[PDB]
Amino acid sequence: NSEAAKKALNDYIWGLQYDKLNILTHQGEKLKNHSSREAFHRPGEYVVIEKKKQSISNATSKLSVSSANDDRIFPGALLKADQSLLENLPTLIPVNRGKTTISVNLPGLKNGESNLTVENPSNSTVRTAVNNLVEKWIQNYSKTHAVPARMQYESISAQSMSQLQAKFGADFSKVGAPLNVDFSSVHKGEKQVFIANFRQVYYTASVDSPNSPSALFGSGITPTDLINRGVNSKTPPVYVSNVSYGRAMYVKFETTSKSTKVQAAIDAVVKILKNTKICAVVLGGNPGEASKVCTGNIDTLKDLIQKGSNFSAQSPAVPISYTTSFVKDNSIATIQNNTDYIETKVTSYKDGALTLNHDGAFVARFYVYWEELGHDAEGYETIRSRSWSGNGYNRGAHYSTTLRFKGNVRNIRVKVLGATGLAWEPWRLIYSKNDLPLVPQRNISTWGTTLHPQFEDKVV
Amino acid sequence: NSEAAKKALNDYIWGLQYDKLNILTHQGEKLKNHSSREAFHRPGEYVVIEKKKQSISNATSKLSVSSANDDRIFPGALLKADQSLLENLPTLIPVNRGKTTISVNLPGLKNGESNLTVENPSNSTVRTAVNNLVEKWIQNYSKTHAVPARMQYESISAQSMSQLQAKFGADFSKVGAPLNVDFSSVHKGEKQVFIANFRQVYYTASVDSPNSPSALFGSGITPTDLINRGVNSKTPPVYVSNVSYGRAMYVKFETTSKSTKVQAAIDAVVKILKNTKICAVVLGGNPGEASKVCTGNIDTLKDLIQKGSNFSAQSPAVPISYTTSFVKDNSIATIQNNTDYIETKVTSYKDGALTLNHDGAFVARFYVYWEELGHDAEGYETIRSRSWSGNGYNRGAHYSTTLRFKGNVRNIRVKVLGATGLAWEPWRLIYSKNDLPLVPQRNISTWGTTLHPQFEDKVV
Amino acid sequence: LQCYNCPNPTADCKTAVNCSSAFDACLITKAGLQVYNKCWKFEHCNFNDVTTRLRENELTYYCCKKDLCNFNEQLEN
Amino acid sequence: LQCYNCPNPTADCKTAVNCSSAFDACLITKAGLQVYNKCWKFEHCNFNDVTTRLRENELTYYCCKKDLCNFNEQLEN
Ligand SMILES: [Cu+2]
Ligand SMILES: [Cu+2]
Ligand SMILES: [Cu+2]
Ligand SMILES: [Cu+2]
Ligand SMILES: [Zn+2]
Ligand SMILES: [Zn+2]
Ligand SMILES: [Zn+2]
Ligand SMILES: [Zn+2]
Ligand SMILES: [Zn+2]
Ligand SMILES: [Zn+2]
Ligand SMILES: [Zn+2]
Ligand SMILES: [Zn+2]
Ligand SMILES: [Zn+2]
Ligand SMILES: [Zn+2]
Ligand SMILES: [Zn+2]
Ligand SMILES: [Zn+2]
Ligand SMILES: [Zn+2]
Numbered sequence A, B: 001n002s003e004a005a006k007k008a009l010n011d012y013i014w015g016l017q018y019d020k021l022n023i024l025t026h027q028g029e030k031l032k033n034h035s036s037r038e039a040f041h042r043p044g045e046y047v048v049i050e051k052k053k054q055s056i057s058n059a060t061s062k063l064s065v066s067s068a069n070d071d072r073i074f075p076g077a078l079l080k081a082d083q084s085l086l087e088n089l090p091t092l093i094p095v096n097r098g099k100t101t102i103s104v105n106l107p108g109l110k111n112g113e114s115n116l117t118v119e120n121p122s123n124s125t126v127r128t129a130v131n132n133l134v135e136k137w138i139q140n141y142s143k144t145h146a147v148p149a150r151m152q153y154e155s156i157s158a159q160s161m162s163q164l165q166a167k168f169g170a171d172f173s174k175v176g177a178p179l180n181v182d183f184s185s186v187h188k189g190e191k192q193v194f195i196a197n198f199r200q201v202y203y204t205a206s207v208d209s210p211n212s213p214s215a216l217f218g219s220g221i222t223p224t225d226l227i228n229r230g231v232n233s234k235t236p237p238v239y240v241s242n243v244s245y246g247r248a249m250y251v252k253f254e255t256t257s258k259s260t261k262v263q264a265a266i267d268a269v270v271k272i273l274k275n276t277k278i279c280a281v282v283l284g285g286n287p288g289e290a291s292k293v294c295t296g297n298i299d300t301l302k303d304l305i306q307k308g309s310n311f312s313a314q315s316p317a318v319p320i321s322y323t324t325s326f327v328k329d330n331s332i333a334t335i336q337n338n339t340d341y342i343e344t345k346v347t348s349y350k351d352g353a354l355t356l357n358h359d360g361a362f363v364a365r366f367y368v369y370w371e372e373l374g375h376d377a378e379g380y381e382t383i384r385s386r387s388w389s390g391n392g393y394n395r396g397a398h399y400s401t402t403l404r405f406k407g408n409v410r411n412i413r414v415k416v417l418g419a420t421g422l423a424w425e426p427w428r429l430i431y432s433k434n435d436l437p438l439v440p441q442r443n444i445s446t447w448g449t450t451l452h453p454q455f456e457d458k459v460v
Numbered sequence C, D: 001l002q003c004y005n006c007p008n009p010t011a012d013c014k015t016a017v018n019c020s021s022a023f024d025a026c027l028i029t030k031a032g033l034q035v036y037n038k039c040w041k042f043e044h045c046n047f048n049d050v051t052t053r054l055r056e057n058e059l060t061y062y063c064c065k066k067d068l069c070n071f072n073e074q075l076e077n
């Protein structure tokens, strides 16, 4: 009976056991938590460069369509949930397929016009069919139905290539190569790098859940057929349930600036430091080319973006992402990318200055102490107390001096004494303060008379 | 005519233009030549850790068969020379094929017995056919024909994952993951790491050049058919011309030692520091498992190797590599992997000691000078001259002193003067020498009398 | 003679129905934000009879005798 | 009646030849490091006639009347 064959195949798919939400898990670098500290001084600042292990976990259902897999992604394609998928170079299961129904969500396609059916679905026929429909829409409805883009935006501070593969897919080390990511620049911390992905979607082609798993195969495909071809619990089958068409691009941002809201700046121009030259890798758009554009400038990127904010409606748009569902229960398949990476973090401790000013009509004494972070011959960290060589000396008709400290100084202590003229108590503590931060400029000034001395501790 | 169709397809393949020996080129990291120098002191040595850009170019025709592509590699498989191949996840061209003849080179298969013909070649049928033949050989000739292994060995000092991908294939970041490569250890230079690949081949399945390119396709495949499926000059077709069966394994070597012939040691055990614990990832062998073995020990690896030095002849061996040829002219296809990487190089400058010994019956004067490499507050390199505080002082009934220099000292200068008793020339230069290397231990000893003083400059 | 026929205003009527013997035409109407797809008598493809039966005050409409001809893009919103 | 027939000693004769009417048997011989595959008369499948005609001094041989039966692994080196 031709209906017992259906149950055999449906029974085989439903009989597979796998962790529905951990079977697709990409594992980048695994690293021990080895630390590192470089430290040195340069004009105005004491720079500390610290390296630390960090992890990133990113889940995603919308996988990217590259030129490496476009010949293989199409609505209704049968794929193996295996290493090939995690690598974003999936594998077509070589087996006859059943009739596939596809729906295109372009505006104006009403009643039944938005639906296709391909009886022998393949990358050639499904595309030829999807294009025919999009072109038929261009010819009949594009001039009275506008198609705005649905923007999907993602961005990250670049740290390592494995870190970027987790964020954008193992695919990325190939797609994002024309960006030529200056990774030498980040380990010295002379400038920051941000990679952003822009996806402008004009329309989608989708597949509704078939009535049963057997409907995706030829009327004659047998459980043995799938067992022979490696379709099982290790690598269960998925099918492309949705393809998004439109335009996509990667953009690089190399910032000398040391600001913090650098990302919030980038995130805000997509609708504040106009520093950073820009590098765009556009994937799709008009065939007349412009695959890579660079550099900035400022908002020729902003012009590049809006250029594809509406579907120009001259040709069918390019495929830019797809989504797969498990044949077993038609639930969306999520890929999980994890990796450890070394995050380089630069910290600047600005130099500071302490000025002592004595303008009082009395003899004064200044005492300045501070702590100092340093290293020894072996390079191990050391903390040491210090003293100003001028401590205790009598001062001043119009005495003034400025102490310039490197950024590695902290916790300044200050004391000021003045002559009283009293034999029983010749010196009195006019002022004293501990735990003083190293601000750019601080004045300890004293003035007044013997009987009524004055002072001020002022941050300029 | 069924022979004009042959010429059309042959004309189409022969009409493709591509750089036959640069179309397959994997490009890893591209890096600017940014340098770096860390330096510090520890008991006995002044260690300098230098980072420099380095390149690696590796060409290869024997690609690896992993579990990710075993369902896809088989003698006579049609593949696209594209990004998928460089990634070692090739793509079967989905198109009917012609009858394929395969030859298995197991010993004892004479006359015609070594040849198969599969009329609808696929991964299922070709394997089923190849296994039937190997098993038929096991049943008839294995007990009177021995099959030794043909060893292929390759090894490299590990520096970066991209460096290892170039050496072993982009595939490696997945296959070699169970090695858990201690990459934290190499940037500090506390131990060296060597990855080696062992391939023991028992037999091969091969395909002779077909009479014409059209023979690889179905009698009915048309130039249009290949054009529709993306087979062209960008991505010309290749076919698997050879599969090697046997056993393969990756081995890791973590050496604390600082020796140089560490590799020559490894290269010599395959037929001297037995330090370094070992980690093996065996790919193939008996189904009874042992996918990963570790650690050493010494030559349980040597036992692991020989265990598969002869074909146990119980089951058909596992596929471990394959070779592809261009359909156009049947020439072997070579993949070329290039990448830039950062090589970490540690250099130790051992401390040294200088001993001055005065045993002569006269007053002596010692002068010691040297140069000293150091850094300033900004971390920039400095070279400075130095002097021993004892220079010039009168010495000795039984005077002796040892000067201990850190490794960053070089070019020691020494002078020795002795009292003469002559009023016109009271002091005479007994000995002097410049540009003295910092050896572990050097003695300047003087003895004798006033009229006949003696000395010796001796490296202990 | 088949028309897109739906029992209530749908923004996307996909049901192809063979009209009975009473009706000999396909009607489609846009009235505000609503759309109508019905089997219809040609004798009643006039503004007065269409508005009152559908209890609508303002509308544009289209009548035709070809199969599956009363599709939404026959009118323009 | 077909036998592996080669005109000279080959270490791997793949040529399947229909024997004529003079021969009614398949011969294979191992003589030193050489192998022979010939169409043969059964009346002459004896050591004396085989050694002299093939001008060999020592050998092992095998004769049979089944098709393609004179293959190298009939003898054991
Ligand atoms: Cu999608
Ligand atoms: Cu700064
Ligand atoms: Cu091979
Ligand atoms: Cu050392
Ligand atoms: Zn430090
Ligand atoms: Zn400085
Ligand atoms: Zn400063
Ligand atoms: Zn409309
Ligand atoms: Zn990966
Ligand atoms: Zn004054
Ligand atoms: Zn240095
Ligand atoms: Zn030390
Ligand atoms: Zn020392
Ligand atoms: Zn033999
Ligand atoms: Zn790659
Ligand atoms: Zn003495
Ligand atoms: Zn009516």
Ligand SMILES: [Zn+2]
Pocket (backbone or CB within 6 Å): D041, D044, D049
């Ligand atoms: Zn005879």
